[PDB]
Chains A and B, each alone.
Chain A
């Protein structure tokens, strides 16, 4: 009897209909001449990797896999689905059935067939597969990542790895817009050199391979001219640039106005509409144009319930078919409650797109953002149909947060941030998952102390125990059971971090090594802090002064190190104990 393994995203409808079976060492593959070319390739790679040959001639003693779209006429597929259908599902949806030695995948479309294979890939462990009936489809139609942060852009290998990762987690969107790419912004008029164009072609190809919509962004708002011959020429620079990417296979475009001095709302929107008509519509196979206005968070967009000048004019002018993005109530913010999306969706008379600034850390680079999607309302799909996160300049560790973004945007109403966070680490880290949880748990909250605040609080259960300890002490209750419990946690933090330093692969380790060192330091300082509490209780001056110096030494190291972690928990505990 075989269990349903960790899946991501959570499929909408899944039932276990049997004990499971082992897939034979050779399979009958059926329907692959007509089935989506990218789905079949994904399936082929997986089979090759897990040592499963494909039969050349049908063999009834071996597992049979049937794959295809609704719109392929393949009856042997409908037979194996057994009354289950993908016909009535939304675009990108699929049906999957494994029972009695047969696996059937039917996509609503090709995107759907590819995603069906991704779920198949997740269900198989050591050749064993549960027997299940699945119908599955996304809540949000556009799901993915906007590479739009400041600082060192992702590398070519970073992006290729990310794209394979998106496909595997059913994220279908990747927006290329790095602030510090000179040709994206600072020098938006200039053509990419030939070798950079070759790297582009590679990313486009890989995107198509993984069903990801590569969105080419451009940010001309610094110095674009709007009127007369200059406006013509500048407009034609957008066309030329977008054309050269179209000609390599790009079918999505974004034009961004964020973080600029010029606030000509009407002219911004006019550029959009013109590009929408002379480019997006003319081409006819190009997806809806994406944008961000110069006012892009509720605070900057709205004043006493009514839109500000720029926003009101921009909403009035911008074409209805154009996707408009906003960051929520602030630039980096705790929540997007339903009522915020309702307000903004109302001003724009449309479904909105989110540019969610988590896990991005360009505003506070000492900390890793390693928590789940948090504070985003689970009914958000009522006003939002396009969801993307802005990641860190650290591609590898961004995967933890993105994993949870895949789940939240695919199956929104079922989303449980703690379960999704745990699953992300479990799926990504393997043997090291438990220890990574211990570390990452202290690194989920982003707070620059002023305008930027978001994410699940740092290790809340520990903070609760710490708070509880100060209560037991100031009301002189017997604290000794909690003190042993707490020595264990501090020991554990140190044990786990030492294990990660020793065993994490380079690709993860070179992103978090300074923060590991930081949490070990703080754990050691928490330990001395308890020694301080215990020695004060035991009226032992020798032990108290010795522990105190050690506690201050650890805090001094953390205060002056670039790495920042557990500010309000592991760090604060030491500060609290020195009073």
Chain B
């Protein structure tokens, strides 16, 4: 939603 990854 706001960035990739965890």
In the complex, what residues of B have CB within 8 A of residue A332's CB?
A: 4-5
Most buried by A among B1, B2, B5, B6: B5
Does A151 count as interface, using CB distance less than 8 angstroms? yes
Does A363 count as interface, using CB distance less than 8 angstroms? yes
**Residue pair A150, B5 in contact (C-beta under 8 Å):** no
Most buried by A among B1, B2, B3, B6: B3
Which residues of A from 418 to 473 have beta carbons under 8 Å from B?
A: 450-452
**Residue pair B2, A331 in contact (C-beta under 8 Å):** no
In the complex, what residues of B have CB within 8 A of residue A451's CB?
A: 5-6
A-B residue pair count with CB separations less than 8 angstroms: 24
**Residue pair A151, B4 in contact (C-beta under 8 Å):** no
In the complex, per-residue mask of A147-161: 1 if CB is within 8 Å of any chain B CB, else 0: 000110000000000
**Residue pair B5, A363 in contact (C-beta under 8 Å):** yes
Does A12 count as interface, using CB distance less than 8 angstroms? no
**Residue pair B6, A362 in contact (C-beta under 8 Å):** no
Contact-residue bracket for chain A: 10 to 19
In the complex, what residues of A have CB within 8 A of residue B4's CB?
A: 150, 258-259, 331-332, 357, 362-363
- Taking CB as reference atom, which chain B residue is nearest A259? B4
- Taking CB as reference atom, which chain B residue is nearest A258? B4
Nearest CB in chain A: distance from B6 CB, A: 5
Nearest CB in chain A: distance from B2 CB, A: 6
**Residue pair B6, A151 in contact (C-beta under 8 Å):** no
Chain B interface helix/strand/loop/mixed: loop
**Residue pair B3, A362 in contact (C-beta under 8 Å):** yes
**Residue pair A450, B6 in contact (C-beta under 8 Å):** yes
In the complex, per-residue mask of A357-387: 1 if CB is within 8 Å of any chain B CB, else 0: 1000011100000000000000000000000
Nearest CB in chain A: distance from B4 CB, A: 5
**Residue pair A331, B1 in contact (C-beta under 8 Å):** no
**Residue pair B5, A362 in contact (C-beta under 8 Å):** no
Which residues of A from 115 to 163 have beta carbons under 8 Å from B?
A: 150-151
CA distance A458 to B6 in the complex (A): 24
CA distance A151 to B1 in the complex (A): 9
CA distance A357 to B2 in the complex (A): 14
CA distance A331 to B3 in the complex (A): 11
- Taking CB as reference atom, which chain A residue is nearest B4? A331
CA distance A557 to B5 in the complex (A): 30
- Taking CB as reference atom, which chain A residue is nearest B1? A150
**Residue pair A150, B6 in contact (C-beta under 8 Å):** no
In the complex, what residues of A have CB within 8 A of residue B6's CB?
A: 450-451
- Taking CB as reference atom, which chain A residue is nearest B2? A150
In the complex, what residues of B have CB within 8 A of residue A258's CB?
A: 4
Nearest CB in chain A: distance from B3 CB, A: 4
CA distance A150 to B2 in the complex (A): 6
Residue from B1, B2, B5 in contact with A452 in the complex, judged by beta carbons closer than 8 Å: B5
CA distance A450 to B3 in the complex (A): 13
Nearest CB in chain A: distance from B5 CB, A: 5
Which residues of A from 336 to 365 have beta carbons under 8 Å from B?
A: 357, 362-364
CA distance A362 to B5 in the complex (A): 11
- Taking CB as reference atom, which chain B residue is nearest A362? B3
Nearest CB in chain B: distance from A349 CB, A: 27
Nearest CB in chain B: distance from A300 CB, A: 10
CA distance A220 to B1 in the complex (A): 15
CA distance A499 to B4 in the complex (A): 36
- Taking CB as reference atom, which chain B residue is nearest A390? B4
In the complex, what residues of A have CB within 8 A of residue B2's CB?
A: 150-151, 362-363
CA distance A151 to B5 in the complex (A): 15
Please list 24 pairs of residues, one from A and one from B, whose beta carbons are closer than 8 Å in the complex, sorted by A's number. A150-B1, A150-B2, A150-B3, A150-B4, A151-B2, A258-B4, A259-B4, A331-B4, A331-B5, A332-B4, A332-B5, A357-B4, A362-B2, A362-B3, A362-B4, A363-B2, A363-B3, A363-B4, A363-B5, A364-B3, A450-B6, A451-B5, A451-B6, A452-B5
Listed in ascending order, the chain A residues whose CB lies under 8 Å from chain B are: 150-151, 258-259, 331-332, 357, 362-364, 450-452
Closest 4 CB pairs of A and B: A363-B3, A362-B3, A331-B5, A451-B5
Given contacts A258-B4, A331-B5, 6 further A-B contacts (CB under 8 A): A150-B1, A259-B4, A363-B3, A363-B4, A364-B3, A450-B6
